[PDB]
Amino acid sequence: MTNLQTFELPTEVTGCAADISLGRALIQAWQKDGIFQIKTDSEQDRKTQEAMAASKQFCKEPLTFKSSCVSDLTYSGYVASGEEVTAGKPDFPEIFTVCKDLSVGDQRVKAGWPCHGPVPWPNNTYQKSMKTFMEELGLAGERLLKLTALGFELPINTFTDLTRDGWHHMRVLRFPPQTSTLSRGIGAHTDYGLLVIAAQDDVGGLYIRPPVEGEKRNRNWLPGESSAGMFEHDEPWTFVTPTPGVWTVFPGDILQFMTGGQLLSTPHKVKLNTRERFACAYFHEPNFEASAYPLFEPSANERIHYGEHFTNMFMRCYPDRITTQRINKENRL
Ligand SMILES: NC(=[NH2+])NCCC[C@H](N)C(=O)O
Ligand SMILES: O=C(O)CCC(=O)C(=O)O
Ligand SMILES: [Fe+3]
């Protein structure tokens, strides 16, 4: 598409008539374009800009310091440019991943649950900026999930019943400038949870793939059907033009599975630009222990254990990271 649809969400979603009309409109936009925008208010906008500023300041730190912000208990922390792999090929942003920030005193960490541990924060100002941002993003994700259930004529809490203490996380990204021979930022892929809410500066680089009539889509939660790299050099790829005062929203793997493909996990990719590009991707996820189920295929026994999918995905992102080594050595998976 050449112009994405932009919506205003209400502060509370109760199931009123306007809620149902909006929820249906959001679903139709996903089914046509693969993505839509939501307007941010003054607080959401500010929190977004504060997160971007903290990201830029952190990236100015020496590489030796950034590399120390790592954990062997959680995937939270720093990812160097070229460390992450998508379809076996290195992605080139530097990243700070924020997963659920759990103390070593948390019962799940004491029990050795995979991926559970405290964030290796660079400092407390950075910590406050990202946690405040993710609180705001979580409120938007809960609204979007209630509206999605209403748009499908499902009980309003269908999806939010799966996101109590949800495994929400965020990737804080800086993409370096391109060269004459290299412009790959992140390869084509689909994300893993229910929703992706994303924000970006004014530089530009994100492309998404809308649903395509007659195009079968891999089911990225299954062994031999990874979505990484698929369609990477074939049209259509919609450029997500930087637009002031909005976040973008598209579905992840769990929504595709639960809706039987009536929604599709939106494939997307990032190209390096002539300038460095800052972006934040937020993932509104089920509880780590939640089992997603088919909504429209009754008598279906299939399930996705979300925590298993997250753990499998991040191990494939970072096969050599100390986090992955400890999972392997201690057979946490
Ligand atoms: N942790 C992520 N969400 N990474 C997004 C990029 C795709 C990821 N490297 C993959 O192979 O699936
Ligand atoms: O750079 C972006 O806008 C999104 C990056 C992304 O897809 C991701 O981190 O999952
Ligand atoms: Fe992504």
Curated annotation (Swiss-Prot):
Positions bound to Fe cation: H189, H268
Activity regulation (record text): Activated by catalase. Inhibited by chelating reagents such as EDTA and Tiron (4,5-dihydroxy-1,3-benzene disulphonic acid), and by DTNB (5,5'-dithio-bis-2-nitrobenzoate) and hydrogen peroxide.
Cofactor: Fe(2+)
UniProt cross-references to Pfam families, sorted A to Z: 2OG-FeII_Oxy, DIOX_N
pH effects: Optimum pH is 7.0-7.5.
Key words, A-Z: Dioxygenase, Ethylene biosynthesis, Iron, Metal-binding, Oxidoreductase, Plasmid
Stretches assigned to the Fe2OG dioxygenase domain: 166-286
InterPro entries: DIOX_N, IPNS-like_FE2OG_OXY, IPNS-like_sf, Iron_ascorbate_oxido_reductase, Oxoglu/Fe-dep_dioxygenase_dom
Catalytic activity: 2-oxoglutarate + O2 + 2 H(+) = ethene + 3 CO2 + H2O; L-arginine + 2-oxoglutarate + O2 = guanidine + L-glutamate 5-semialdehyde + succinate + CO2
Alphabetized PROSITE patterns for the sequence: FE2OG_OXY
Keyword Repeat: no
Keyword Metal-binding among record annotations: yes
EC number: 1.13.12.19, 1.14.20.7
Function (record text): Simultaneously catalyzes two reactions, namely formation of ethylene and of succinate from 2-oxoglutarate, with a molar ratio of 2:1.
Note: A dual-circuit mechanism has been proposed in PubMed:1445291 for the complete reaction, in which the binding of L-arginine and 2-oxoglutarate in a Schiff-base structure generates a common intermediate for the two reactions.
Protein name per the record: 2-oxoglutarate-dependent ethylene/succinate-forming enzyme
Gene: efe
